[PDB]
Amino acid sequence: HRKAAGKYGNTLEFGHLVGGEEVLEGPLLERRNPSDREDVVARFPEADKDLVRKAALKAREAFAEWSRTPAPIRGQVLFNLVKILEREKPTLTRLMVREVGKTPKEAAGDVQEAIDTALFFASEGRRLYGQTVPSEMRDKELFTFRRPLGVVGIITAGNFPIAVPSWKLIPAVLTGNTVVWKPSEDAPTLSFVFAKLFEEAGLPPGVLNVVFGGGKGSTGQWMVELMDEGLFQKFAFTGSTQVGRWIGEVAGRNLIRPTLELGGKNPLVVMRDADLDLAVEGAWWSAFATGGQRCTSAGNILVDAPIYEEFKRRFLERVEATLVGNPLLHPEVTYGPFINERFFARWQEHYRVGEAEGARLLFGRGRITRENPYPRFLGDPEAGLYGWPTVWEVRPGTRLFTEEVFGPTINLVKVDGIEEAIAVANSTPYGLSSAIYTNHRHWAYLFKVGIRAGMTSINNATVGAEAHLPFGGVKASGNGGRESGIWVLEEYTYWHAVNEEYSGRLQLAQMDTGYVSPKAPTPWGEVLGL
Amino acid sequence: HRKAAGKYGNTLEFGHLVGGEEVLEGPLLERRNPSDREDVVARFPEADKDLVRKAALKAREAFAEWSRTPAPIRGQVLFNLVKILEREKPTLTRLMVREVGKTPKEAAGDVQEAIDTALFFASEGRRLYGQTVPSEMRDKELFTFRRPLGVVGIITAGNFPIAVPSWKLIPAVLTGNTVVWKPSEDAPTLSFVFAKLFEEAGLPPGVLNVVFGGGKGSTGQWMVELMDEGLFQKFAFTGSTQVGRWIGEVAGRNLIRPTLELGGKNPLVVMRDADLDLAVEGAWWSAFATGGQRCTSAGNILVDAPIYEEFKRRFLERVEATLVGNPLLHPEVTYGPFINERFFARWQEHYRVGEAEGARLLFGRGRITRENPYPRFLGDPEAGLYGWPTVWEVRPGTRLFTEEVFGPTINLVKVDGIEEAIAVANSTPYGLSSAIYTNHRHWAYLFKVGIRAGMTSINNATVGAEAHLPFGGVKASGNGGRESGIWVLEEYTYWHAVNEEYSGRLQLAQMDTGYVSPKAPTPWGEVLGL
Amino acid sequence: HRKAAGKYGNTLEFGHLVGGEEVLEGPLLERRNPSDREDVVARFPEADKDLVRKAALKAREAFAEWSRTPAPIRGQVLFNLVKILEREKPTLTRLMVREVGKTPKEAAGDVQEAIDTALFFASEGRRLYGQTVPSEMRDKELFTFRRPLGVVGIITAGNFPIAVPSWKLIPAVLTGNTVVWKPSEDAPTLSFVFAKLFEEAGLPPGVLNVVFGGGKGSTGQWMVELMDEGLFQKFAFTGSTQVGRWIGEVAGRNLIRPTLELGGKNPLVVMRDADLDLAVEGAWWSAFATGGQRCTSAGNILVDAPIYEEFKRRFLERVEATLVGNPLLHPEVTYGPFINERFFARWQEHYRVGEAEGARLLFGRGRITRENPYPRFLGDPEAGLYGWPTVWEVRPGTRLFTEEVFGPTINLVKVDGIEEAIAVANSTPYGLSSAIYTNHRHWAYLFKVGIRAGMTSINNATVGAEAHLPFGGVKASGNGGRESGIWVLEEYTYWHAVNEEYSGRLQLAQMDTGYVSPKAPTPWGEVLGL
């Protein structure tokens, strides 16, 4: 951590964290403040594949001591981290606004998710329950224990730069594993600091190693490839489905079950009996929280025929009122810039794909500029990449309907009755989150058991999962793993079954078992006289 | 089992089952067919306190071998019992119609509950899970095991002569305990036969001992008193609150937690938006199943002001259509006789208590006789004790409102809105079952978290719990125990915590624990430049 | 389902089972009795990829009705299957001796494992527990449910033709999935019959579809490939690591977590303080049960220096006494033929690999023939492929030490003390089963926490897992999934998190949460004066 003054804070320069050492090796990258490109947040190196290799070997060297550290002591380290995150929450909030362009409200929420996670798993150090199981043989006892896997490879996005890494890092080390972490190039400073807070909390050197870099053709890819060298016993990834399937494949052949959170096209249904203003507010927040840059963001609002026109009218009213701007200078805004150029580009393209397939554009004029200004913009739109709130009407089966698009866009879709709403809600390659606004018990029930989704909200947004429920998707949104709560323990441990014999002889299950035979049946119809 | 021909079947004569032996000792009692007093079902002896003592000592002698029988083998015995109950279900159904006056439909249901219970616990023999727990010390392992208690004393009523004993007998023996069982004098034959089916399934002699007799001033009381001699490690009772509190007390001072299912005054709410015919049908069945002789039977129907008159009109219509009669000769009837004279007497008395406190009688003329006939009676009303379906309107705070009355009676009570419905529903000394009929998500939610009851039904009767949910009441309905499913394991086992040391030294929890200390905190506001 | 007389039973001819229909389509294969190749057990077709496609689509068409069948009713179907398997156990035992060459002792054990599994999961239909979870918000409730995946593709080996398919088939249908099953061409009749017993038990047509054929370049491969067409939501496989990695890869990219049981090289340690005769008997049975044709078979006996010579002497004595022969004509034999020619061939080659790398052959002369007879052979050794019991001494690091070889072979390896035994035990690509014979608490403990294995036995064989513990390996033996007991539910279900809102407002977790702030701290040192 060395300095040099920028305009919204110091420009930091730092290296990889490998075996406790800081390592400034590789071509320098930089992260610019997405709200103001003049402000340079960090300068950091790109780890080459040899350095990721070295990091995996430090992690391997650290595993023996860490796995033998009693789980309750490892949990005390996480408790130290709860206190330290609490202390640092205002500072991490402000750094997150500068580095990834989130609002202070949402940035604090993001940090809070990590605190919540750290408290849950601090206590989990005195749990991690296995089972005692009765043998079918005399003088024999059966047991199960949860054991750590080894070295975990972790790759994380930058839209939730503290929360979502915490879901992986914290349970991974709690359960006795060591970690190599390749964080997003969109949030290197936050990632560096987080790793230093784990260090402050007492995590031994080499249990967490941090290698900075890009993804495709860079450190991200190098690290996935190292699964073929046996240097990882586990892998976790948050990002695109397409990258996910590739990581699925590599891990697959190396007999690893990766944790894959892969995005979504999240349906939000509004039935004719819904509380309109509540549903409008829920649809709006589902679409525009984080400027539509969440895996869980609303993809399609499916609106019941009899309220379509009224809902549309009220929803456009609500969207028109959205404040957009530089969240450092204007904290009251709903959303600010795109996190990176990649997402801005895919978002630009969706306007063209929409027009080409016959979608109707109701609201939105693409990138906000001086030449193309937005009536409720606050700040300089040329200092970064900011998008008009965007609303379409679309038919099912179209690319705008089925394909994930990060950024401030949403589709309205007319449906008629509950059976159609469920079928249209399922007509996507995804199955992460979902939502229905209704007051009818029966309609909520049908949606709940008829949707194919990892997560459903009744009269609530598609966004804003609580930290202590299982998080994960079906279909193209993931592969069966769940994060958070007790459910993530399956991701970072394996079952060890033990049978202890005391009988002093070889006795064979299923063959020597001393099953008791019936006695002769009494003819009760005859005895009772029916 | 010796014979002598009655008119609906043989008259049986049998003794107590103690240590495998049949024991015909004590003054003879008899059970008459409640539908036809000319038909004698059984002749059986009253066990004296010395014989209950002897039975507890056989159970104690049998416990060493049975507790050491591997749980999966004990479960195979219950599996044998599933097959045998299945075989015998038509015969047990017909015996139950004759001996306790239930309809064939309800009698089969009763037997099915035992089959369901037997299957659940057969499989539980390979479960009974304890925990493996991580020590806070190195070279140390922690464990929990479920252990059997010892000898269980069980007293059961006769309104569910196969189902409710099965809830106690089956988990008790599965978990490695032995049993002394004092069954209802209203169902001695069913009880004898059930014990013989356990014998057929391979249960060793002395694991189940059966002592017949009465309750107060008889075998029931003798057996409760033996808790003061240390001959029981557990006790379970189904019956009246008043007897329950006394058993609570005796067990209390002997450091036993008894299982006490003690009856109820079960509220059923009908909100203004309810599906009327569904609620009417649910209220009717809640009131008149088993002729109102269930702990779970509806005590009070709380009806929302705007539908009061319409609901009343439709409910009286439905009650008037009830068929009452001899279920042996007329299986289509809803309910038949009272199970015993005691319940008939308390039911007679409620007419007088009602009139005296100002309740309004809407329907019912007390006992059905030739002089006082019921328009939809089928059979001879003088051959047994049968009651007019009975409906009152009552004020809260009255004896008819608060006090349990077995038999075919029910109260209507006008309430206005959800808050009042909840408060009036709670205005009873009981808290067993409960029900609300509504379509509004919010009203169901409020009732569900606002009621004080062990069990709640949304758009369903107060009766008809499924066999694999926890069954039990709060307030005067019980003391915290639950029967059925995984929840009953707490009733028949105790936790044994074991710590195994390998460290070769004395190391002290909370004092020697190797907790890790923080490193120095970095001033991040200053380093980042905020 | 039609006949033609062989010599040890009828020669059956049958087709695939697709949507209830029997379908005789594809080039005919045959299965010969491995103990006597003159006896033809079955003639059956090779399903082409289009027919597997058709089978997967029947399964998809059947899933709507089956998944909506209440879990307790699906469990009643399995209960029917428990009774039917019990009835058929003597017949299935005899068919299994004829079709795959196992001893009657082991064949009965195999069938029993399916009965055990069927009872466990029959009961599980009233369990399948999800969670209720407290919200951090007022007027909000959280829930988790277990949901079925869809259509399951299953490929099974023939060494455990009833037991190991039951581990997959039974939980898969219990949890609401439908199945396409490609059984081993070494046990088509057993597979056909088992499917017909599910049909007898009331399983609806199309919930289980059976497609016969081979593996690589045949039906096995066709079925793995269909994961790329979306026709399977899950896959389970028992066989070789090499095939497993490929299935890992295909499933990987299709975001599926396959269940992969992939074989092993199972260490059995004998410490200087062991009960010698007990360890000798455990090593012997671990090596030669099923003629060494189990994933769990002993690969290496690691013997502590001070007892090496004595153990070797006693072990060779014990091996010399092994009866080998035709189990149909001589049921008292320990093991009979190889299941198929493939395994015999790999086993023949291991003699050459051993000689070439310097292993010392202590016992064994390859294939038992009339020209090369075995002193304790019973029957005609030319009528099938039978192997001399085979014992080597080997160094760690060699092919005979590290590589799995199905068949009657075992290695002795000298180790010195517990640390070396653990290191040598881990020096293999595998981690399925493991075992140590010792009396010393501390040595058992060290092995238990030092071994890398899914399963460990203390003073018991590497073989003979009980049906109700989690079964599965680490390293090259699997990918994290476990079968049997509660642990297999993660394989055939996904978590559905539901949040229900009642607050009538949009309230944001992590941001609106009503956390309470501390009061000012009292200065207790000053107040107390200490």
Author numbering:
A (entry chain A), B (entry chain A), C (entry chain B): 1 to 530
Question: What does the publication say?
Answer:
Found in both prokaryotes and eukaryotes, aldehyde dehydrogenases (ALDH) (EC 1.2.1.3) constitute a large family of NAD(P)-dependent enzymes with molecular weights of 50–60 kDa. ALDHTt contains an unusually extended C-terminal arm forming novel interactions with the N-terminus in the quaternary structure which interacts closely with the substrate entry tunnel. The ALDHTt monomer is composed of the three domains common to all ALDHs: (i) The NAD(P)+ binding domain (1–125 + 148–261) comprising a Rossman fold, (ii) the catalytic domain (267–458) and (iii) the oligomerization domain (126–147 + 494–501). However, the presence in ALDHTt of an unusual extended arm that wrap the facing monomer through H-bonds and salt bridges shows for the first time how the tetramer is not merely a dimer-of-dimers carrying out their functions independent of each other, but that the interaction of the N- and C-termini in CS-related monomers may regulate active site access in NCS-related molecules.
The recombinant wild type crystals yielded a structure with a product molecule, propanoic acid, in monomer A and B. The product is ~6 Å from the catalytic thiol, which is in the attacking conformation, while the Glu261 can be observed in the “In” conformation in monomer B. Interestingly, the ligand, situated inside the aldehyde anchor loop within hydrogen bonding distance to Arg294, Thr296, Gly464 and Ala465, is observed in two different orientations. In monomer B, the carboxyl group of the propanoic acid is oriented toward the catalytic cysteine and is coordinated by hydrogen bonds with Arg294, Thr296 and Gly464. However, in monomer A the carboxyl group of the product is now oriented toward the aldehyde anchor loop and coordinated by the same residues as in monomer B in addition to Ala465 and Thr462 through a water-mediated hydrogen bond. Indeed, in the full-length recombinant protein Glu261 is observed in the “In” conformation, which may be indicative of an intermediate state depicting the molecule leaving the tunnel after catalysis, with repositioning of the glutamic acid. The different orientations of the product in monomers A and B is likely to provide snapshots of product handling throughout the aldehyde anchor loop. It is worthy to note that a similar product orientation was previously observed with ALDH1A336.
